[PDB]
Amino acid sequence: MNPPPPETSNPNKPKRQTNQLQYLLRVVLKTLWKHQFAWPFQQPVDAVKLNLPDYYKIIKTPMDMGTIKKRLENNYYWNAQECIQDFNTMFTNCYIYNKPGDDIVLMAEALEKLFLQKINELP
Ligand SMILES: Cc1nn(C)c(C)c1-c1cc(OCC2COC2)cc(-c2ccnc3nc[nH]c23)c1F
Numbered sequence: 001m002n003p004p005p006p007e008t009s010n011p012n013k014p015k016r017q018t019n020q021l022q023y024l025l026r027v028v029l030k031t032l033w034k035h036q037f038a039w040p041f042q043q044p045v046d047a048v049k050l051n052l053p054d055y056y057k058i059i060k061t062p063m064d065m066g067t068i069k070k071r072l073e074n075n076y077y078w079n080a081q082e083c084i085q086d087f088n089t090m091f092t093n094c095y096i097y098n099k100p101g102d103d104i105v106l107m108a109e110a111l112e113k114l115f116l117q118k119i120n121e122l123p
């Protein structure tokens with residue numbers, strides 16, 4: 001079945017609202033969110049709905065842009081590199097579970113190209 005989703009709130013974390021993290025929410029994530037290919041990544045993989053009973057037997061550090069959005073809105077991160085690491089985990093999970101040429105891999109590839117374009121320059 002589905003595991004609990006990754007945590008998005010933690011009052012015990014040291015938190016910051018750097019200019020880069022504000023940018024990652026207002027510009028980077030909000031632009032990726034609107035991409036025609038973003039919809040598979042706007043929430044945790046629902047292994048039950050998608051009939052992927054093996055997905056969480058293989059992917060042990062799940063992540064998605066819905067989780068990232070909630071983290072950013074909770075000032076969950078200390079710095080932009082923590083947020084960028086979550087993005088990279090999302091893309092990498094897709095490439096691990098799936099194979100080149102799969103539709104979902106083509107979609108992640110598109111999103112990742114745009115992501116790298118947008119983070120090349122941060123405030
Ligand atoms: C494209 C595509 N083609 N086909 C035939 C299917 C079933 C999809 C599809 C649909 C989907 O919908 C998400 C809604 C349901 O709950 C939110 C999510 C994912 C999906 C996301 C992230 N990683 C994945 N690894 C394998 N699938 C992954 C997906 F691939």
Ligand SMILES: [Cl-]
Binds near residue numbers: 008009010011074
């Ligand atoms: Cl919180």
Ligand SMILES: [Cl-]
Binds near residue numbers: 010012013014
């Ligand atoms: Cl902590």
